[PDB]
Design a protein around this ligand. Structure first.
Ligand SMILES: Nc1ncnc2c1ncn2[C@H]1C[C@H](O)[C@@H](COP(=O)(O)NP(=O)(O)OP(=O)(O)O)O1
Ligand SMILES: [Mg+2]
Ligand SMILES: [Mg+2]
Length: 427
DNA sequence: ATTATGACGCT
DNA sequence: AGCGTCAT
């Protein structure tokens, strides 16, 4: 009764850019705006691999991971923008910099956790509290929420904007606005703030985004995807039972892989809500103490993972695959590509040191061998004492050379190289 | 020949 | 420390 926590203590948003790399290229090249459009890396092999797709192109069935040549079969008028290529490899600098633009705007409103190049979590609890204190007894107008969906509404007694507004009206009509500690009210004020953040992002960058507002990161992330693009979705604690009743387990963050599959197989269920029928000890018994307790709370809409105060990446890496016949088979080849990777890594480390007052102290070198399906076949580290590309590539070769069975020749051929700078200290 | 690259858990 | 999992 009065002692069961309900996970309504926080307001958390997840903001995620709509077709991010495509919008970066469309801002730069107005000819691509409002068109079926995709971003591709490389070109020789089947026209290049697609990594981002405009919503106009998605309507034709173009998806991420598709070869551009195949995408053209689905969408003959597809426009393409190519990732910059430097030193023989794709270079993602333009998108990292555009990402920094967005994260810096978001960080004016609240502490953010950078969750990926185009998304960040926002802990709005304090901001909601402040805004409720200035704005006491003021009813919240639908005009303050022009792009907000309320998940689960309308219910009860033909066009999508009509539905959105009817749901929003039901929600606001039902609100108890003179209760400063009401969770539903807090979420609503959170959504007002997220509307403002999103307007600021679009004003100052040209980029559109979607957002989820809920009481934790998992629900905010799930909410965000419910009405992409260019919209935001509020998922309340009370909406959770119906929402989870038909929600495939795999749609919840961290359950999209083997663990989620095990939950489905061992328990013989399909939807997140079915998890409520198990005791905490049962879930721990199958999936471990940590996972069991997490699942027990998550299926009830309760999650406690904090929004970490971290706007900057914790590692700086460069990787390249060498698929099929292009696998690296000579010592010279391995060293040349280590140098290329190391030169890009140096350029990025030096900019990072000047911008963020920190220095990496460890270099992690990882490789994949022809035939091994695993992402990394071998990982080894060494000290990172100087931002010097020749030294870093030489040290990486020193740390991997004894993986070579026998040569001038390298065997088995290398299908991936990866250099990653880690363990930053302030400087 | 799904590429580049992040975060974090396990032992 | 090195490997595995999950993610965009
Ligand atoms: N598997 C992958 N490999 C490489 N780059 C990837 C990637 N997944 C994403 N990216 C890159 C390219 C993407 O532009 C960017 C953000 O990924 P999303 O947020 O998953 N997708 P987007 O923002 O494009 O569309 P939406 O509106 O549905 O959110 O990261
Ligand atoms: Mg996105
Ligand atoms: Mg994203």
């Amino acid at each position: 009764g009065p002692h069961m926590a309900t996970g309504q203590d926080r307001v958390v948003a997840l903001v995620d850019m709509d077709c991010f790399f495509v919008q970066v290229e469309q801002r730069q090249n107005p000819h691509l705006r409002n068109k079926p459009c995709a971003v591709v890396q490389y070109k020789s092999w089947k026209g290049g691999g697609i990594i981002a797709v405009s919503y106009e192109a998605r309507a034709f069935g173009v998806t991420r991971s598709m070869w551009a040549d195949d995408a053209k079969k689905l969408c003959p008028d597809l426009l393409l923008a190519q990732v910059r290529e430097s030193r023989g490899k794709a270079n993602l600098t333009k998108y990292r910099e555009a990402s920094v633009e967005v994260m810096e705007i978001m960080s004016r409103f609240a502490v953010i956790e950078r969750a990926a190049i185009d998304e960040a979590y926002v802990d709005l609890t304090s901001a909601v509290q402040e805004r409720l204190q200035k704005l006491q007894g003021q009813p919240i107008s639908a005009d303050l929420l022009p792009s907000t969906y309320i998940e689960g509404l309308p219910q009860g007694p033909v066009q999508k904007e009509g539905m959105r507004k009817q749901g929003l009206f039901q929600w606001l009509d039902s609100l108890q606005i003179d209760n400063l500690t009401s969770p539903d009210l807090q979420l609503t004020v959170g959504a007002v703030i997220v509307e403002e953040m999103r307007a600021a992002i679009e004003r100052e960058t040209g980029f559109q985004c979607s957002a989820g507002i809920s009481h934790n990161k998992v629900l905010a992330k799930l909410a965000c995807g419910l009405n992409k693009p260019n919209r935001q979705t509020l998922v309340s604690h009370g909406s959770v039972p119906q929402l989870f009743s038909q929600m495939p387990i795999r749609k919840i963050r961290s359950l999209g892989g083997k663990l989620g599959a095990s939950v489905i197989e061992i328990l013989g269920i399909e939807y997140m809500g079915e998890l409520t029928q198990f005791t905490e000890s049962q879930l721990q018994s199958h999936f471990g103490e940590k996972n069991g307790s997490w699942l027990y709370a998550m299926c009830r809409g309760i999650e406690h993972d904090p929004v970490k105060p971290r706007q900057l990446p914790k590692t700086i890496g460069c990787s390249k695959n060498f698929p099929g016949k292009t696998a690296l088979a000579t010592r010279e080849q391995v060293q040349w590509w280590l140098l290329q990777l190391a030169q890009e890594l140096e350029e990025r480390l030096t900019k990072d040191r000047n911008d963020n007052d920190r220095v990496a102290t460890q270099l992690v070198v990882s490789i994949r061998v022809q035939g091994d399906k695993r992402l990394s076949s071998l990982r080894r580290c060494c000290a990172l004492t100087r931002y010097d590309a020749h030294k870093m590539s030489h040290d990486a070769f020193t740390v991997i050379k004894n993986c070579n069975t026998s040569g001038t020749e390298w065997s088995p051929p290398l299908t991936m190289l990866f250099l990653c700078a880690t363990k930053f200290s302030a400087s």
